[PDB]
Design a protein around this ligand. Structure first.
Ligand SMILES: CCCCCCCCCCCCCCCCCC(=O)OC[C@H](COP(=O)([O-])OCC(O)COP(=O)([O-])OC[C@@H](COC(=O)CCCCCCCCCCCCCCCCC)OC(=O)CCCCCCCCCCCCCCCCC)OC(=O)CCCCCCCCCCCCCCCCC
Ligand SMILES: CCCCCCCCCCCCCCCCCC(=O)OC[C@H](COP(=O)([O-])OCC(O)COP(=O)([O-])OC[C@@H](COC(=O)CCCCCCCCCCCCCCCCC)OC(=O)CCCCCCCCCCCCCCCCC)OC(=O)CCCCCCCCCCCCCCCCC
Ligand SMILES: CC(C)=CCC/C(C)=C/CC/C(C)=C/CC/C(C)=C/CC/C(C)=C/CC/C(C)=C/CC/C(C)=C/CC/C(C)=C/CC/C(C)=C/CC1=C(C)C(=O)c2ccccc2C1=O
Ligand SMILES: CC(C)=CCC/C(C)=C/CC/C(C)=C/CC/C(C)=C/CC/C(C)=C/CC/C(C)=C/CC/C(C)=C/CC/C(C)=C/CC/C(C)=C/CC1=C(C)C(=O)c2ccccc2C1=O
Ligand SMILES: CC(C)=CCC/C(C)=C\CC/C(C)=C/CC/C(C)=C/CC/C(C)=C/CC/C(C)=C/CC/C(C)=C/CC/C(C)=C/CC/C(C)=C\CC1=C(C)C(=O)c2ccccc2C1=O
Ligand SMILES: CCCCCCCC/C=C\CCCCCCCC(=O)OC[C@H](COP(=O)(O)OCCN)OC(=O)CCCCCCCCCCCCCCC
Ligand code: HEM
Ligand code: HEM
Ligand code: HEM
Ligand code: HEM
Ligand SMILES: CCCCCCCCCCCCCCCC(=O)OC[C@H](C)OC(=O)CCCCCCCC[C@@H](C)CCCCCCCC
Lengths: 535, 535
């Protein structure tokens, strides 16, 4: 008797505790059903997959520089001096069933985690989901993005490898040791001595399995709690105002679709872990200071820092008996990037002057300057990311390496400006398109007027029509407009039988009539709620 | 203008978010001010200190069996093959400034964590805090205790040492291989091979710094949330009923005293880490299968399992072509111990019939059978612990080793019975003493009657006095009774000046009558609330 068991367990729960009111509040909480609001959920799910795979990896990984001859199963690396970290990473890859798959899906989950954090940041920045409220949420999210970047940096550096060890030698050692006043001191504190210090990988292992992931988990908890109790903002729409949340309740629809999205995201990650090879450490021999490859790139999230290193024009300063290497330039650049990213909402509010409590998002077109600035920043980030890849770009796409380097150098001041101007004008022209649609109706097929040979597009007004043909122009309301009769009630009722065969006419008529009635009911409910709110 | 800054920050917080009602609820939450309710806080604080010191330790610890010659500073161990784990533990002890202190305070915090968990378990069990509302809390707390025990095991097993290594060899390896159908398979899965498998310490390091601490943190969060929302139970008292919490609010008093208690617990643990030497691994050479020591004990929280191993009388069964060693006996014993501990509240309610919502604690005297059973269990646990220590007990206290082993064997069935009987009768006699006080008043000095030579103790009634000398007996209300006029309004007004010199008589009188007024005001307020609840 499952129903009896469920009722008895509910009574027991509500007797031991009294969670009825709180649980009802959680279930009734309404969440907007916009697709762009699942971008953060992508990052959350990738983080969960990262945790689950990381536990499995920690069950088999041994962090240490203690030198060992492989004497394992991978023949091409046998009798070669390697660290225990590399040896156990190879053991995971080869001598543990499914270990290669687990580490590959872990690395793919890391890449998706970074990418989805970046896409979520784009969404919130361009839709203005940070101003007045949620500004602290944006701040902690920026901290979270930085932590994710460095977490992946320590992760793919964890198995002592030629590629990743070269990346460590470049960034962690050179940049740290070039910093003027305390650079060498920070280097020695971090590495326990010179660069190959015997504690680097154990320290990174601690940082990467417990310390940084613990902070990421705490900040994700704060992030999700803030989103939960500072009700999710929504785009302007029919019944959507600054003092309501139009969407679907947590229990029936939102919960099921979020769980299904989690399932699909982990399916994509597993499929990629299987079919796409990520970080073949067996190909990448053990780290040796004397050995190196030509690629020498970090993961795509640190690729912009690496590209900054490559592009910056070798400017070094030599004060009285001292040196200020080019590493400090990139270090200060990263510091500025992170400071600006963290402090943007406060910078934006100081500049514009808007401290009003904003709960309705604004379409990126409706804010030309901010969308222009975001496009400029994304252009700079892409420029740096491809500058880091200039080696392979030059190799495959036949362009001289010096040409790629100088293309990056010139573009990082030219391309951001070009993209800013183009994005600003593009946003304003999207606004102009919205206004033309508002004042003339949607466009359709052309008709030749009866008496004379006039051609008229035969528009379709979106609002009340004046006594004569032309309609009364509507006022923009911050919400998307239908620019194709395609997406309106025009040519959208195919025979509802099947792909191969029809259904009985009675069933088809019943189905289509019921669907039309449901559409009428939904639109009327939205219209009446909107009228009640604004009247 | 700190006041203005605080006001502006509060307004900004209440504008961005709306935490006014929730924060007021948290601040106004009332917590009973009984000392025994700080026992769980002791464990929580020791856990926090454990986290803080463990992060520092992981910054310097390298888990690996990779063999290395020390070549450090510690002269007595130079050129000796040791695992990198032992080498880095020695590096923490000697090479790192304050590393010895950090690891010692970490181990002392582990011992205090186990001890305070045990004391808190005793408190709740004997006071009946596990009844209907909080059996789930009891269950998760039992899981927490088990996790704490095993994490301490893995923690003092992390630095591969002679003592910890032989303890691992005995408990983990032997008792795992002993298990009949899957013992050897479990051993091979855990160690990745034979006992000295080269993944054991990395696996334990992961389990100990990330996995088990994560589960313990989640369970402590659930525990504290349950205590917070299922308002803390309280002992019977003047104004205390099953539907109220008499105590102090969170903000002014409880928060301050809890923070101060955490400070003092940290101070005790730091003082111990300084003055008392805990696990001096340097005296203990690196683990070798051949080297041994006479002591060979685990930490006190696993000493009971070790004592079970020692005492259980070598009963092995040999099915058709197989063996069932004596280790499986102890494995089943531990299983039974944990199962009974976790399932006691449900066992208690099945036995007694209590399905009532209990919010008033029971005095251990007021619940004899449960008090007797708890005393019996504590006696068994102490017998097992001292049986594990029987080696050192025999060495120092001159008792034959065989004599101690057989004392343990006989007493593990005799001492529990003796302690059960004694505790049951002791509880009933405490009840009898309480009723004697209720019916005769508190006892005082003797007086010789005027006409004849009778001697009367000159009692002091605690309630209304009959028309004649003898008082009207009061009804027992589950609250402690004052058996000394010491603790009542008698002999409690020393000169309030100072230790060496007095104060002006006007000041002394003002202070003393102010205190008298305050204490009688408190008594009257409690009395009025008690009368108001029913009257
Ligand atoms: C970790 C990462 C993983 C993801 C986790 C994050 C998830 C966050 C989502 C939040 C959801 C939530 O908390 O809902 C709970 C929600 C609590 O809030 P509520 O009920 O709305 O109370 C009124 C408002 O809270 C009153 O609030 P308000 O609306 O007036 O606004 C005030 C708000 C102001 O807004 C804020 O500032 C909120 C943001 C908090 C900041 C950071 C705190 C979170 C840090 C998390 C760190 C994790 C590590 O302050 C808060 O409410 C703070 C609450 C903090 C809880 C955060 C939880 C995480 O309700 C429940 O408790 C429902 C669940 C019931 C549980 C019992 C079920 C049966 C019991 C069985 C037990 C055992 C069975 C055996 C038999
Ligand atoms: C980790 C270990 C470390 C220790 C952590 C554990 C501490 C737990 C203590 C709980 C205290 C608590 O949650 O109070 C919050 C409490 C939420 O509860 P409430 O407000 O009473 O809401 C009505 C009741 O919750 C309605 O509940 P009810 O009284 O009707 O009974 C229903 C109850 C049923 O009872 C239960 O079953 C509760 C037990 C929950 C089971 C396990 C959940 C917890 C798991 C934790 C795992 C951690 C890892 O269900 C719940 O309430 C579940 C709530 C779950 C929250 C647990 C938090 C942990 O109020 C607040 O949120 C106050 C704090 C406000 C925060 C905002 C401050 C300013 C914002 C600034 C943001 C950034 C500034 C930048 C500018
Ligand atoms: C720092 C910086 C940007 C320096 C400049 C160097 C650079 C990137 C130049 C552009 C690269 C191109 C497009 C070369 C082709 C020749 C060329 C320049 C033609 C004119 C360009 C132009 C304006 C054309 C008009 C129409 C148009 C927009 C055409 C674009 C055509 C292309 C190539 C589109 C895709 C862009 C693209 C993927 C460029 C390479 C960038 C990267 C990082 C590829 C990564 C990558 C590589 C490198 C693999 O080898 C590989 C092997 C197996 C599986 C996967 C991959 C993989 O994903
Ligand atoms: C399994 C099992 C319990 C087997 C029996 C072995 C055993 C514990 C026998 C009892 C030990 C005793 C009390 C020996 C003294 C001789 C004796 C038996 C006298 C008769 C006992 C009796 C009924 C006396 C009447 C009055 C009475 C109650 C006297 C008790 C006297 C004592 C010793 C009280 C304290 C109890 C106690 C600490 C016993 C030893 C237990 C342990 C584990 C001590 C651990 C310990 C040791 C071993 C150190 O060397 C040490 C060195 C430096 C700093 C700290 C320590 C430290 O903590
Ligand atoms: C060789 C080898 C080892 C292979 C394995 C690889 C490995 C190591 C690990 C991966 C293996 C596993 C275990 C994969 C599956 C992971 C997993 C749990 C998937 C669940 C998805 C699934 C099976 C769905 C079935 C379809 C179905 C009926 C769905 C509805 C019922 C379900 C499952 C609902 C789940 C709801 C859900 C995702 C809860 C997540 C809980 C968390 C952390 C947060 C909740 C939460 C969410 C989800 C928000 O979006 C949100 C947005 C704004 C503010 C707050 C929140 C918030 O608090
Ligand atoms: C990849 C790209 C790089 C990354 C890009 C992200 C960084 C943030 C982006 C842009 C910041 C500059 C914005 C433009 C600032 C406008 C200047 C001005 O002239 O002030 C006019 C305003 C309007 O006032 P109004 O009553 O509307 O009158 C209309 C008059 N025509 O005045 C004010 O309130 C504000 C005056 C002071 C503003 C100070 C803002 C900067 C604070 C320091 C942070 C560092 C900035 C880094 C810059 C890159
Ligand atoms: C681990 C990284 C992250 C996780 C797990 C995460 C998760 C989420 C989720 C699930 C939401 C609600 C759904 C949505 O708005 O799409 C959200 C909202 C938000 N995120 Fe994040 N995000 C992350 C990174 C970031 C970054 C880098 C920023 C900057 C940021 C700022 C915000 C803001 C301001 C909101 C509020 C949006 C709203 O209220 O509509 N987050 N986050
Ligand atoms: C929080 C976000 C995280 C990110 C972005 C991340 C990223 C990465 C990446 C990219 C790798 C390289 C894998 C490879 O090269 O095969 C890695 C390795 C590893 N990660 Fe993480 N990780 C995260 C969290 C975790 C967690 C929570 C754990 C433990 C529970 C963990 C444990 C490990 C281990 C043990 C390795 C070494 C595997 C190997 O050497 O192949 N990671 N991580
Ligand atoms: C990590 C281990 C533990 C921590 C951090 C912890 C913490 C706490 C704290 C602070 C309290 C409230 C204060 C008090 O009642 O003394 C509490 C209550 C409680 N604990 Fe634990 N405790 C732990 C172990 C245990 C164990 C081993 C049991 C069994 C248990 C069962 C309970 C129960 C039933 C309560 C409710 C008592 C009440 O309502 O007053 N806990 N715990
Ligand atoms: C939660 C309860 C915990 C308990 C009961 C516990 C217990 C112990 C004990 C008794 C030791 C032996 C120390 C020595 O022999 O000097 C130890 C070692 C260690 N603990 Fe834990 N610990 C806990 C949590 C943690 C956490 C959270 C971390 C990491 C953040 C950690 C990291 C370490 C490390 C790295 C060692 C080895 C250091 C050494 O060998 O000296 N512990 N643990
Ligand atoms: C850990 C749980 C331990 C479970 C043991 C499962 C024993 C399976 C093999 C028994 C066997 O027949 O082997 C031959 C036998 C050794 O020789 C004899 O035929 C005469 C032996 C007379 C003593 C009988 C005592 C039985 C007590 C147990 C039934 C109680 C278990 C609780």
């Amino acid at each position: 008797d499952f129903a009896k068991l469920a009722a008895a367990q509910g009574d027991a729960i509500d007797s031991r505790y009294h969670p009825s009111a709180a649980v009802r509040r959680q279930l009734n909480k309404v969440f907007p059903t916009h697709w762009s609001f699942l971008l953060g959920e992508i990052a959350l799910y990738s983080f969960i997959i990262l945790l689950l795979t990381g536990v499995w990896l920690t069950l088999f990984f041994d962090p240490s520089m203690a030198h060992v001859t492989y004497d394992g199963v991978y023949q091409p690396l046998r009798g070669v001096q390697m660290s225990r970290a590399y040896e156990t990473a190879l053991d995971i890859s080869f001598e543990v069933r499914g270990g290669l798959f687990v580490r590959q899906v872990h690395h793919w989950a890391a890449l998706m985690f970074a990418a989805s954090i970046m896409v979520h940041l784009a969404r919130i920045f361009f839709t203005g989901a940070f101003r007045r409220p949620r500004e602290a949420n944006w701040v902690i999210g920026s901290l979270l993005l930085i932590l994710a970047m460095f977490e992946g940096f320590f992760g793919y550096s964890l198995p002592d490898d030629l590629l990743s060890g070269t990346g460590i030698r470049a960034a962690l050692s050179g940049i740290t040791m070039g910093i003027p006043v305390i650079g060498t001191w920070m280097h020695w504190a971090l590495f326990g001595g010179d660069f190959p210090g015997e504690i680097l990988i154990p320290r990174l292992y601690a940082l990467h399995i417990l310390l940084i992931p613990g902070i990421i988990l705490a900040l994700i908890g704060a992030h999700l709690a803030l989103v939960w109790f500072q009700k999710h903002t929504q785009f302007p729409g029919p019944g959507r105002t600054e003092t309501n949340v139009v969407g679907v309740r947590v229990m029936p629809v939102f919960a099921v679709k979020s769980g299904a999205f989690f399932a699909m995201i982990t399916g994509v990650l597993g499929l990629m872990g299987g079919l796409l090879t990520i970080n073949p450490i067996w190909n990448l021999g053990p780290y040796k200071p004397s050995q190196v490859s030509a690629g020498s790139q970090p993961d795509f999230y640190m690729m912009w820092t690496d590209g900054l290193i490559r592009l910056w024009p070798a400017w070094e300063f030599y004060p009285f008996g001292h040196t200020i290497p080019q590493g400090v330039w990139v270090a200060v650049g990263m510091g500025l990037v992170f400071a600006l990213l963290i402090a943007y909402p406060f910078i934006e509010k100081k500049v514009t002057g808007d401290d009003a409590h904003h709960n309705l998002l604004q379409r990126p077109r409706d804010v030309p300057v901010r969308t222009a600035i975001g496009s400029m920043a994304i252009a700079l980030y892409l420029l740096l990311t491809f500058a880091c890849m200039n080696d392979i770009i030059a190799l495959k796409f036949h362009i001289s390496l010096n040409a790629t380097t100088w293309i990056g150098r010139i573009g990082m001041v030219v391309l951001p400006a070009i993209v800013y101007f183009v994005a600003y004008r593009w946003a304003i022209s999207l606004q102009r398109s919205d206004r033309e649609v508002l004042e003339h109706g949607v466009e359709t097929g052309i008709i030749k007027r009866l008496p004379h040979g006039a051609y008229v597009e035969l528009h379709q007004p979106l609002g009340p029509v004046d006594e004569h043909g032309h309609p009364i122009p509507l006022e923009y309301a911050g919400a998307p407009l239908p620019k194709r009769m395609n997406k309106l009630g025009s040519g959208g009722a195919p025979g509802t039988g099947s792909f191969l065969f029809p259904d009985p006419a009675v069933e088809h008529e019943a189905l289509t009539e019921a669907a039309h009635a449901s559409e009428h009911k939904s639109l009327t409910a939205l219209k009446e709620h909107q009228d009640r709110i604004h009247g």
